[PDB]
Design an enzyme around this catalytic site. Structure first.
Site, PDB file in Angstrom:
ATOM      1  CG  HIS A  64      -9.565 -10.463  -0.397  1.00  0.00           C
ATOM      2  ND1 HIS A  64      -8.240 -10.432  -0.297  1.00  0.00           N
ATOM      3  CD2 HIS A  64      -9.979  -9.348  -0.166  1.00  0.00           C
ATOM      4  CE1 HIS A  64      -7.856  -8.880  -0.113  1.00  0.00           C
ATOM      5  NE2 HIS A  64      -9.008  -8.434   0.069  1.00  0.00           N
ATOM      6  CB  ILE A 121      -1.144  -0.008   1.376  1.00  0.00           C
ATOM      7  CG1 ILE A 121      -1.831  -1.129   0.615  1.00  0.00           C
ATOM      8  CG2 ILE A 121      -1.181   1.443   0.864  1.00  0.00           C
ATOM      9  CD1 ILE A 121      -2.769  -1.225  -0.174  1.00  0.00           C
ATOM     10  N   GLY A 163     -14.371  -7.640   9.182  1.00  0.00           N
ATOM     11  CA  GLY A 163     -15.412  -6.823   9.724  1.00  0.00           C
ATOM     12  C   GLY A 163     -15.755  -6.090   8.486  1.00  0.00           C
ATOM     13  CB  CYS A 219      -9.100  -3.166  -0.352  1.00  0.00           C
ATOM     14  SG  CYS A 219      -9.102  -5.008   0.645  1.00  0.00           S
TER      15      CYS A 219
HETATM   16  N1  NAD Z   1      -4.574  -5.499  -0.516  1.00  0.00           N
HETATM   17  C1  NAD Z   1      -3.954  -4.651  -0.404  1.00  0.00           C
HETATM   18  O1  NAD Z   1      -2.485  -5.805   0.431  1.00  0.00           O
HETATM   19  C2  NAD Z   1      -4.511  -3.960   1.516  1.00  0.00           C
HETATM   20  C3  NAD Z   1      -5.784  -3.410   1.004  1.00  0.00           C
HETATM   21  C4  NAD Z   1      -6.376  -2.577   1.507  1.00  0.00           C
HETATM   22  C5  NAD Z   1      -5.673  -2.215   3.188  1.00  0.00           C
HETATM   23  N2  NAD Z   1      -4.717  -2.740   3.509  1.00  0.00           N
HETATM   24  C6  NAD Z   1      -4.202  -3.041   4.978  1.00  0.00           C
HETATM   25  O2  NAD Z   1      -3.013  -2.140   4.502  1.00  0.00           O
HETATM   26  C7  NAD Z   1      -1.882  -1.991   5.457  1.00  0.00           C
HETATM   27  C8  NAD Z   1      -0.752  -2.621   4.842  1.00  0.00           C
HETATM   28  O3  NAD Z   1      -0.962  -3.637   3.964  1.00  0.00           O
HETATM   29  P1  NAD Z   1       0.471  -3.921   3.106  1.00  0.00           P
HETATM   30  O4  NAD Z   1      -0.348  -4.860   1.825  1.00  0.00           O
HETATM   31  O5  NAD Z   1       1.088  -2.534   2.732  1.00  0.00           O
HETATM   32  O6  NAD Z   1       1.107  -4.842   3.968  1.00  0.00           O
HETATM   33  P2  NAD Z   1       2.470  -5.030   3.841  1.00  0.00           P
HETATM   34  O7  NAD Z   1       3.544  -5.839   4.024  1.00  0.00           O
HETATM   35  O8  NAD Z   1       3.369  -4.847   1.799  1.00  0.00           O
HETATM   36  O9  NAD Z   1       3.704  -3.483   3.888  1.00  0.00           O
HETATM   37  C9  NAD Z   1       3.914  -3.661   5.651  1.00  0.00           C
HETATM   38  C10 NAD Z   1       5.078  -2.364   5.585  1.00  0.00           C
HETATM   39  O10 NAD Z   1       4.597  -1.671   6.460  1.00  0.00           O
HETATM   40  C11 NAD Z   1       6.414  -2.217   6.858  1.00  0.00           C
HETATM   41  N3  NAD Z   1       6.951  -1.469   8.793  1.00  0.00           N
HETATM   42  C12 NAD Z   1       7.163  -2.785   9.613  1.00  0.00           C
HETATM   43  N4  NAD Z   1       7.073  -1.959  10.646  1.00  0.00           N
HETATM   44  C13 NAD Z   1       7.205  -0.753  10.176  1.00  0.00           C
HETATM   45  C14 NAD Z   1       7.443   0.048  11.116  1.00  0.00           C
HETATM   46  N5  NAD Z   1       7.000   0.084  12.705  1.00  0.00           N
HETATM   47  N6  NAD Z   1       7.887   1.338  10.752  1.00  0.00           N
HETATM   48  C15 NAD Z   1       7.866   1.974   9.561  1.00  0.00           C
HETATM   49  N7  NAD Z   1       7.015   0.757   8.452  1.00  0.00           N
HETATM   50  C16 NAD Z   1       7.070  -0.881   9.287  1.00  0.00           C
HETATM   51  C17 NAD Z   1       7.115  -2.894   6.140  1.00  0.00           C
HETATM   52  O11 NAD Z   1       8.199  -3.083   6.308  1.00  0.00           O
HETATM   53  C18 NAD Z   1       6.719  -3.492   5.157  1.00  0.00           C
HETATM   54  O12 NAD Z   1       6.938  -2.565   4.281  1.00  0.00           O
HETATM   55  C19 NAD Z   1      -2.400  -3.484   6.580  1.00  0.00           C
HETATM   56  O13 NAD Z   1      -2.985  -2.372   7.720  1.00  0.00           O
HETATM   57  C20 NAD Z   1      -3.155  -3.803   5.031  1.00  0.00           C
HETATM   58  O14 NAD Z   1      -4.317  -4.804   6.264  1.00  0.00           O
HETATM   59  C21 NAD Z   1      -4.421  -3.588   2.417  1.00  0.00           C
END
Ligand code: NAD
Ligand code: NAD
Ligand code: NA
Ligand code: NA
Lengths: 339, 339
Positions: free
Chosen positions: A179, A13, A214, A152
């Site tokens: 999904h 994201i 949720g 999403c």
């Molecule tokens: N389809 C999707 O992938 C999607 C859609 C909507 C929402 N989300 C939500 O968005 C959020 C991120 O999801 P994602 O798919 O990008 O996961 P991801 O694992 O790709 O991204 C996580 C990132 O956060 C970093 N991180 C970890 N700890 C950290 C810290 N303490 N400080 C700063 N950065 C840190 C990690 O290094 C990693 O690069 C989640 O809450 C997820 O549920 C994801």
């Protein structure tokens, strides 16, 4: 105007929010923070993507900064939000995309050195307000310091639910999202983190994996009159991106299926859901929505009505790209409203 | 007292019907017909399987016959059913698992030289009677020369539908099946046979693919009081086997979820659906049902009720192995009733 954005967590994201923000003329990314990757590594993960192709532009670094399409972006590597000098980078709005600071108390920590507001890239674990662009973003106030852009799935379902509820009235509905796989799942059978969700720990590539969500219930917060009228669940399946909402609902008012199609088409063509909801009457499959910007694409031919009040509606979404574009648009929307 | 079986089309279903018939002493496979594989190729496809493991036993051929478990099986390679000498091979009941002979007029072509009855391994295109073991097989009459074992999805849904309808009443329901890949799909984007199901010709391994299906409406034929009260659709996803039914229904009587669970457990434990329906309360995923014999396995933890009359129920099925066992069981039941 110019939304001055910062990104915490440079993941799926974070990196796509970055790309969306770079594409917009009215948003700038002034800083990035992720402690699990160096500069060279950031350059690599931004350059290459297994789903969304090469970054559209030259990426490099110089003098400790990320350089994208001629622009310099400041970079930090802090585990703890309180230690990120956002004010010294000039950041106003923070995309909180780590997945672990989903309460007001935690997200608040970003705002002690000059930044103005935080947008969580997930549904909050507390009563932080959620907004879905095109559905309830007119409810945002400039006193809402910490906000969430929901999920999403909620961004896919809420616009479809608003249209159907407004035109026909939803008496009750149950949702399934089929999904795409996400970062919390595992390549082979192993222990889920915290031992939360055992099914998520099973090999992603070879399983259909039931999961709680949720997201349908959350539509009840976006659209208050549907509180207690919607819920659902998910099946995680072996594709790397793109998902689909399957909504089964009872209507208060009888409808021909063409009446529902017409209402969706109308909402897609003009008004607040233009650019949010769309439709297709073609024989599409999930890969056809890779890098599709819409929150929700109604699949005209995939749906089915049992009878004139009981219907199954289908709507696609690029869970990664659609959501990331909505988040940037919410940040920009807040920046305009805040003056 | 032995069911003398022939198999037309030695495919996923053909070969697994063959395995199932070999595990019982009261069914014998006397002949196999498939014009797209030599005897050597037949031995190979039976020996090895990407989902169900090695054939459990020695497979060879000798003097033009397939040799398995000490028994000799006659082999034909005819495209036209009327050219197959079933009579001379000693076959009584034909498993019609080619996918292309799904009307009475076409299936009757098997009955010109001494065979007695044909069992379509799919829902018919006409008014051929369908039977689901444990639900309506007692409606079978010895005068029913051509019959169908319905589909995998109907065999998973009908038992669950019967239990819920008998105990609480189904006012209406809509079904989705998240379904494993099948032989009618393509490895890369191309034209489907007959230009019929465009979505099905899109690369199977990288797409969620919507598909139409009469499997839920077919439950209205198996259980006539539900005629007009059920329909649904499918999403084909990238797993090689195992699928799951997601039934959203409105009950006539209010119920606690535990009452639905209790009803399913009772039907699994004794009576006509013993061995047909089962249940689990564990954190299962699709691969846990590979080589599961049940028509329907109710997933207790995956289900969700919005309120006491509106519920989403989830049931797993091994679409290849469960179905193949039911067909053999149907053929045997027919042979007993026929005397
Ligand atoms: N389809 C999707 O992938 C999607 C859609 C909507 C929402 N989300 C939500 O968005 C959020 C991120 O999801 P994602 O798919 O990008 O996961 P991801 O694992 O790709 O991204 C996580 C990132 O956060 C970093 N991180 C970890 N700890 C950290 C810290 N303490 N400080 C700063 N950065 C840190 C990690 O290094 C990693 O690069 C989640 O809450 C997820 O549920 C994801
Ligand atoms: N999950 C499943 O695979 C499943 C479950 C239930 C029902 N069915 C149904 O059973 C039927 C067979 O399905 P499948 O998955 O085994 O397909 P398949 O493609 O694996 O098998 C079809 C076989 O029939 C053979 N064949 C083709 N033309 C023939 C002919 N003229 N004469 C004799 N044999 C011929 C082919 O060579 C092939 O071996 C279809 O109607 C299908 O919908 C499949
Ligand atoms: Na920009
Ligand atoms: Na046998």
């Amino acid at each position: 105007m110019v939304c001055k954005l910062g990104i915490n967590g440079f993941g799926r994201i974070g990196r796509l929010v970055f790309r969306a923000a770079m594409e917009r003329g009215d948003v700038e990314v002034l800083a990035i923070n992720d402690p699990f990757m160096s500069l060279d590594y950031m350059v690599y993960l931004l350059r290459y993507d297994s789903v969304h192709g090469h970054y559209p532009g030259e990426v490099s670094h110089k003098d400790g900064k990320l350089i994208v399409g001629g622009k310099a972006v400041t970079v930090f590597n802090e585990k703890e939000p309180t230690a990120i000098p956002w004010g010294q980078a000039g950041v106003h709005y923070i995309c909180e995309s780590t997945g672990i600071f989903l309460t007001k108390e935690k997200a608040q920590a970003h705002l002690t050195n000059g930044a103005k507001k935080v947008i969580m890239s997930a549904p909050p674990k507390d009563d932080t307000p959620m907004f879905v662009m095109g559905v309830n973003n007119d409810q945002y106030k400039s006193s809402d310091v910490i906000v969430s852009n929901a999920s999403c799935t909620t961004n896919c379902l809420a616009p479809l639910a608003k249209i159907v509820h407004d035109k026909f009235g939803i008496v009750e509905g149950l949702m399934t999202t089929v999904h795409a796989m996400t970062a919390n799942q595992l390549t082979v059978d192993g222990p889920s983190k915290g031992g939360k969700d055992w099914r998520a720990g099973r090999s992603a590539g070879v399983n259909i994996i039931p999961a709680s969500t949720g997201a349908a219930k959350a539509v009840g917060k976006i659209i208050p009159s549907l509180n207690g009228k919607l819920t659902g669940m998910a099946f995680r399946v072996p594709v790397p991106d793109v998902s689909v909402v399957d909504l089964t609902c009872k209507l208060a008012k009888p409808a021909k299926y063409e009446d529902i199609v017409a209402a969706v088409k109308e909402a897609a063509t003009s008004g607040p859901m233009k650019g949010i909801i769309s439709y297709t009457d073609e024989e599409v499959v999930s890969s056809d929505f890779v890098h599709c910007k819409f929150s929700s694409v109604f699949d005209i031919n995939a749906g089915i009505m049992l009878n004139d009040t009981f219907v199954k509606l289908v709507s696609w979404y690029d869970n990664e790209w659609g959501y990331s574009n909505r988040l940037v648009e919410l940040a920009h929307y807040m920046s305009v409203q805040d003056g």
